[PDB]
Amino acid sequence: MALNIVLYEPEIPPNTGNIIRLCANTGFRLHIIEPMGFAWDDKRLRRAGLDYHEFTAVTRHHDYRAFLEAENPQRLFALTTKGTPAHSAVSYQDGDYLMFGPETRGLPASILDALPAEQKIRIPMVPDSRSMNLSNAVSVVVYEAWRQLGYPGAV
Amino acid sequence: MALNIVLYEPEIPPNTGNIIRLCANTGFRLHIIEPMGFAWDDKRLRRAGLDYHEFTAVTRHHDYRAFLEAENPQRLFALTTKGTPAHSAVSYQDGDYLMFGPETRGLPASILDALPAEQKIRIPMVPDSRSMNLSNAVSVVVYEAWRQLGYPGAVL
Ligand SMILES: Nc1ncnc2c1ncn2[C@@H]1O[C@H](CSCC[C@H](N)C(=O)O)[C@@H](O)[C@H]1O
Ligand SMILES: Nc1ncnc2c1ncn2[C@@H]1O[C@H](CSCC[C@H](N)C(=O)O)[C@@H](O)[C@H]1O
């Protein structure tokens, strides 16, 4: 299937490690927009317990513009606490790209402002909550989308 | 609301830190069955970026039997790769307790064998997948259950 997770300038290695495993366990495709806050090193990756098939599937983009041009996403959603519809309120479809920001910074306003409110998605939280852990946020979105499609590829 | 997450002998501090924040963000109640693989230290907790309201809400149980006796769960589910219904296949209700195993070991067979297959839940994964990260598995279950109830307590 054709669902895509995009990490914008991820900073914390274990978050990305968790996300690689997640996408491999679900068949989602993972994209990373450079620069990252860590070395992309096959050794550290296998070191973290990741198999080759898991991390070579990942595609790395030199920057946001390069990503758009390379991927030409059919639809692009941004996950942000400043979003409107819940992640379970959108109907995901093939060719969707779901974008997440860096741990300390979040997504730059410039990228957010170019998207319709309807494509900026907020995972619900209780009032006055602090942000979710990045890999947890990705997990929640991936599994909701996958559920919507009937867990294709899971037996 | 009354939904409960239970960690059985969690080993890896950051996993638990993530789960504390998750439960606080969602209004789920967190339970931990000792012994843990780390010191329960308010200083390290606030150190990790956790607020006081987040980690004092957590209830720690000396062991599994003490947990059952203290909590008397209306229904107890175990999350295991060896489970049957998907996490999205159960209808969660108030008084549910959802139990997760430790990172290196998983839940002991003794606990699993005492549960009906119908209460052993598997989060779907592609064939020949390796286990999920613990906090990611908890997040997925928490958000599915919360979704079923209409995200009560979240203002949308
Ligand atoms: N409730 C939520 N809804 C949507 N995205 C979320 C989210 N919580 C976290 N994220 C995602 O996770 C990323 C990193 S967390 C964002 C920064 C936040 N101020 C913090 O305290 O860490 C975000 O850029 C966003 O993509
Ligand atoms: N596919 C799945 N379905 C249900 N529970 C799962 C699961 N994958 C992991 N878990 C839960 O996560 C627990 C720990 S296995 C997770 C360890 C993970 N590799 C880590 O380092 O964090 C298991 O006991 C189980 O309760």
Author numbering:
A (entry chain B): 0 to 154
B (entry chain A): 0 to 155
Q: How did the manuscript describe this experimental structure?
A:
The enzyme responsible for 2′-O-methylation at the 34 nt wobble position of the isoacceptors and in E. coli was recently identified by mass spectrometry and designated TrmL. However, there is a group of minimalist SPOUT members, which contain only the catalytic SPOUT domain and lack the extension domains. Our results demontrate that the minimalist SPOUT Mtase EcTrmL functions as a homodimer by engaging residues from both subunits to bind tRNA. The overall structure of an EcTrmL monomer subunit is composed of six β-strands and six α-helices, in the order β1-α1-β2-α2-α3-β3-α4-β4-β5-α5-β6-α6.
We determined the tertiary structure of EcTrmL in the presence and absence of SAH, which is the product of methyl transfer reaction. Although both subunits have a bound SAH, the conformations of the two SAHs are strikingly different with respect to the orientation of the homocysteine groups. The adenine and ribose groups of SAH form a broad interaction network with the cofactor binding pocket formed primarily by residues from three loops (residues 78–80; 99–106; 120–124), and their conformations are exactly the same in both subunits. The SAH in subunit A is in the characteristic bent conformation already observed for SAH and SAM found in TtTrmH, HiYibk and TrmDs. Although in subunit B, the homocysteine group of SAH is located near to residues Asn14, Glu102 and 130–133. In subunit B, a HEPES molecule from the crystal growth buffer is observed on top of SAH in the potential active site and is well stabilized with high density occupancy. From the chemical structure, the HEPES molecule is similar to the ribose and the phosphate group, which suggest that HEPES may mimic the U34 or C34 of the tRNA substrate in this context. The HEPES molecule in subunit B is located in the same position as the homocysteine group of SAH in subunit A. This suggests that in subunit B, the structure is in a state in which the SAH and the tRNA substrate are both bound. Three loops (residues 78–80, 99–106 and 120–124) form the SAH binding pocket, and on tRNA substrate binding, loops comprising residues 79–81, 103–106 and 130–133 form the active site.
